[PDB]
Structures are given as structure tokens and as C-alpha cells.
């Protein structure tokens, strides 16, 4: 029993995290099999990230222009390119604690672990939510950019996530693996709009499961509803519409608690009406969303 | 920029993770140099945990009861020891991943990471405190006992917590690696009291801290107080009294916001006194007190 915000293990990844240096600045990269990936803003000094054309600030590098560090080694850098905001470094030798990963797109609403590193040194990790707005709220200080967000599946590392921006509000903005960006985000440093910050209501259903499946039952009411009629009150309070996917996406959690969806639906929606009253659901004074109805199951077996 | 809940790398402690088995039983194991440390009530079934003599049931098991694998792996029991609530399996074989380590008993209000594994299996990690009353509010499920706490500075792994109990309220009893139980609790099967649950002063005022340097000053009032004027209020909402150990240890984040610890004491009155009007700070709608002025000075260097 008991309900935590958990992070997956992060051995897998923390002997991937190595040092990439490019003339002053340094940054995490990725190692794996005989590739380095880091954000391609380690080729830019301050004044350039005001407006850097990265295609000509990258034709004055050379291999020899990146020094990537993994641990006490240096590595030789064989050959460069850039791919969109990632810059893909070649070396000689392939990484011995290579785990078995993929790179994958994930959607927003999804979760993911953090392994937050300082230049190449792991410091800590927490789990994270891709907001409906392709932002994140983590935590990440001067030598964080290119820590990576992921997944595991058993063996398999699923890499979706890396840190390149900080944005004026101070929310964070990054890349897959394959250097695209999450969200309308630029490599630059100038005014970035992130758009309406939306609650992920099939998180916040999934984790009212996860409080009745630990005892908490105080916010279930007598009424139910209908999706339209859920939905009007989501649009008011800045919800994530419902669909019949999350309906069905929920179906073990209702099945386990007996529980039909659009009657926990209902008891959201009074929740978002009346508010709390002052009370905590699973020790929280407010509605959580980052959580998955996966990331429920896996904790409330 | 940002403030979260993060624990330490878990990778160094995943490598001493062990199955132990004994009978019918199945938990986790800490295999460090040529020792498996695991909680004791492995030799006992549903039946003896209600009132187990543990000599008497341990006199009953030879070194072939225990099954230790590590992974895929088979160790060899060369030895037996009970060590008050936790068993000391001496194995044949120094784990080859076994970093440097100490063992630590932690004082309440301090904070440590857990990896929550399955049957040997690491399955995640998240960060707890040691309360006041010596509980934890953790996540364990079934076969998550053996389970351990850790702390790390730099490349030394100090192991604090053992999960040995899951209380009737659910909340969580464990040992130090010396196998002393935080607290009055005992591996038994009977009712036990938990004291009140006092919140971590120090830890929250701390916390206030954090929420400054990051932008949240809503809540800073034009008011001081005194540390009995302030513990009379203290006592009142089940607060830690402050004392001036508290107040020293607080001082570098006093000194890094211009802001004296008596005047945010002042600060957190107000708050316990007039609540939150249903605002937020650090996107939290109560008062935390599970990070320690080391964790917000790690977090806000």
C-alpha cells in the first residue's frame, strides 16, 4: 500500500551520461553504441544564442572542436553532423554499458523519469509529465542542458526526452531523441510562448483510482454524468477533453474498484466545483495529472 | 530554475540488490563485499508472524534454507547470523559492485532515497523522510520488503532505511543496517501505535526558502517573531519546536535571500494561522516538510 511519484531506476542510463565541451561551454551528452548526442546549442556562446544561424557556427567546428568526457576518458571523435537540434558525434568506440533502448516521440499527457546530470555526473531523478503544452516542470541549474528523459520496459530504455531550453517563465522546453522539439520551441534565447497550461484529465481520473484503491473515498458522490456534459464543465476549468480512448484506457481501474468511468467523471466534477473544503486526497491538496493510468497500475498492483 | 522531489542516482545500489528466499517466503536482499543483509521475518510464515519467537524459528534453518540469487545467479550460504531484526547471510562471493558504503542511522527530519524492488528486482525510486514518529509514508507492495534507504556523498553510499512493516494505518516501519528499528515497532503482526504525526519545522521554513529563490514570494509578510513566541503557535498546529540548531542550519539560505529565519518564521505563523487561501506555493497547496536545508541548497546552487 501506499501512493508515490516514482522515477524508474537510473542505472541503465546514468553509464550513458557523458561530458561534451565545445569551446567554454559544456553540457551532458548520450552515449550510445559508438554515438554521442547532445543539444547542438553547446556549439553557441552567449551572444550567439540571441540569433545563431547553427549551420555556420557548426562549419567552424571541426572533430577536434568537441571534447566529450565519459567519466575520467576521453573520447576520439571520429565525425559530426547535425540533426535538426541534436548534434550526433562520432566516436571509436562504442559504449561498453549500452543498454538495450529505443528513441521514442511520446505523446502529451505521458510520463517519463529525469536523470538530471552536471556535465556529464548524474545528480538526481524525478519523474516528469509532458504538459498538454509540450512543456515540462522539472528542475534543471547552468550544465543540465542534454539530461535526458525515458522510459523502461523490462531491458529496454526508452529515451524521449532531451533538455536543451529554460524559457523566460521559467518552465522547460527540449527535444527527442532525434532532435525535434516538443512543442512550437526554438534553440534560441528570445521571448517564447508556451500556449494554455491544460489539466490531463485522464491522469487526474486515473489517480482518483489510485485513491480509492488506497482508502481514500471521501470525494466519491451519488451522482454520474455523460461525456458532453463532463466536458462542458473540462472546458471551464481548463481540462483536456475526455474521449471514449481515455474511457477505455481507464477500463482495468474501473473494473478493479467497481467503479464505471463516467461516475468517478462525476465525482470529478464536483471536485472541480466545489473544490476540497480544505481535505487532501492521497496526501495532496489539489487534483494530481501526472499521473498515467499505467503508472497507476504498476503501483497498485 | 525549478524545485522538485528528487532522489539520489540509483544505480550503485541496484547492483546489491538480491533475492533471499527461506521456505515459502521471498523478499529483498543487500549483498555487499561477501554479506547479504535481509529482514529476519523471511524465515517466518503468515502463521509465526503473529507471535514469532525468532531464535527458536531461526534454530530450525541451516545455511541451505537460504536461497540467495543475485540476478541469474546462485549464491552460496557459508554462514548465518541474526543481528537483532535483520539476518546476515555470509556468501562465498565479494559482489563485484559493491561501492563504497557506510552504514548510517538517520535522525528524524532527515531525508533519503528509496528503490523500491520486487523479489530482487529494482522497480523505482523516490524520496522519503524519516518522521518525527519514525514512520514513512512509502509505497511498498508485497514482496517489496528488504527494500532499502541510501543517502550518497559523491561515491559513498550510506544505507539508512531497511522496509521491514507495513502498519494497519499504512503507513511504513523499518530498520537501520544494524537491523534497530526506527521506533517502538516490531516485525509482529499486531496492533502498533504510531505517535502523532508532527510536521518538520525546520524542513518547512527551509521549503520557503526554496520557494523565494524560485520566485514564490506571495506569501512574505511585513512581520517578525520570536523562537518561543513562534513555537507557542508551533505547538498548537503539531509543529517541531525550533530551536537554535534549527536556526543555524537554515543560515546560508538566510544569508542567499537577505531574509532573517525569524521573519520567515514569522511568515510560516500567518500561513498555519490563516491557511493558504487556496493558493500555491511551488505548485503545492499545503506546507511541505519533506525536503531538508541540504536538499534545497543541492537543488539551488
Redesign the interface.
Known amino acids: ?12 542510463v ?2 550513458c551520461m557523458v561530458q561534451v565541451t565545445c569551446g567554454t561551454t559544456t553540457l551532458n551528452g548520450l552515449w550510445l553504441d559508438d554515438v554521442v548526442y547532445c543539444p547542438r546549442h553547446v556549439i553557441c556562446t552567449s551572444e550567439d544564442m540571441l540569433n545563431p544561424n547553427y549551420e555556420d557556427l557548426l562549419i567552424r567546428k571541426s572533430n577536434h572542436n568537441f571534447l566529450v568526457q565519459a567519466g575520467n576518458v576521453q573520447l576520439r571523435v571520429i565525425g559530426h553532423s547535425m540533426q535538426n537540434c541534436v548534434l550526433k558525434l562520432k566516436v571509436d568506440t562504442a559504449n561498453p554499458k549500452t543498454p538495450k533502448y529505443k528513441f521514442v516521440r511520446i505523446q502529451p499527457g505521458q510520463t517519463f523519469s529525469v ?2 546530470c552536471y556535465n556529464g555526473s ?5 519523474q516528469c509529465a509532458m504538459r498538454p503544452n509540450f512543456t515540462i ?5 547552468n550544465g543540465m542542458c542534454g539530461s535526458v528523459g525515458f522510459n523502461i520496459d523490462y531491458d529496454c530504455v526508452s529515451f524521449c526526452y532531451m533538455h536543451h531550453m ?1 524559457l523566460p517563465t ?3 522546453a527540449g527535444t527527442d531523441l532525434e532532435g525535434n522539439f516538443y512543442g512550437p520551441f526554438v534553440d534560441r534565447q528570445t521571448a517564447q510562448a508556451a500556449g494554455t497550461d491544460t489539466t490531463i484529465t485522464v491522469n487526474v481520473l486515473a489517480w482518483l483510482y489510485a485513491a480509492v484503491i ?2 481514500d473515498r471521501w470525494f466519491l458522490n451519488r451522482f454520474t454524468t455523460t461525456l458532453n456534459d463532463f466536458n462542458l464543465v473540462a472546458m471551464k476549468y481548463n481540462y483536456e477533453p475526455l474521449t471514449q480512448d481515455h474511457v477505455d484506457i481507464l477500463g482495468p481501474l474501473s473494473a478493479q474498484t467497481g467503479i464505471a468511468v463516467l461516475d468517478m467523471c462525476a465525482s470529478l466534477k464536483e471536485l472541480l466545483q466545489n ?1 476540497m473544503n ?1 481535505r ?1 486526497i492521497l ?4 487534483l494530481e495529472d501526472e499521473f498515467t493510468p499505467f503508472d497507476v497500475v ?2 497498485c ?1
Do not use: C, D, I
Open positions: 500500500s501506499g501512493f508515490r511519484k516514482m522515477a524508474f531506476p537510473s542505472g541503465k546514468e553509464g536523470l538530471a548524474p545528480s538526481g531523478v524525478y516542470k522539472g528542475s534543471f541549474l529554460e521559467g518552465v522547460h488506497n482508502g473544490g480544505g487532501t496526501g495532496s491538496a489539489l504498476r503501483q498492483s
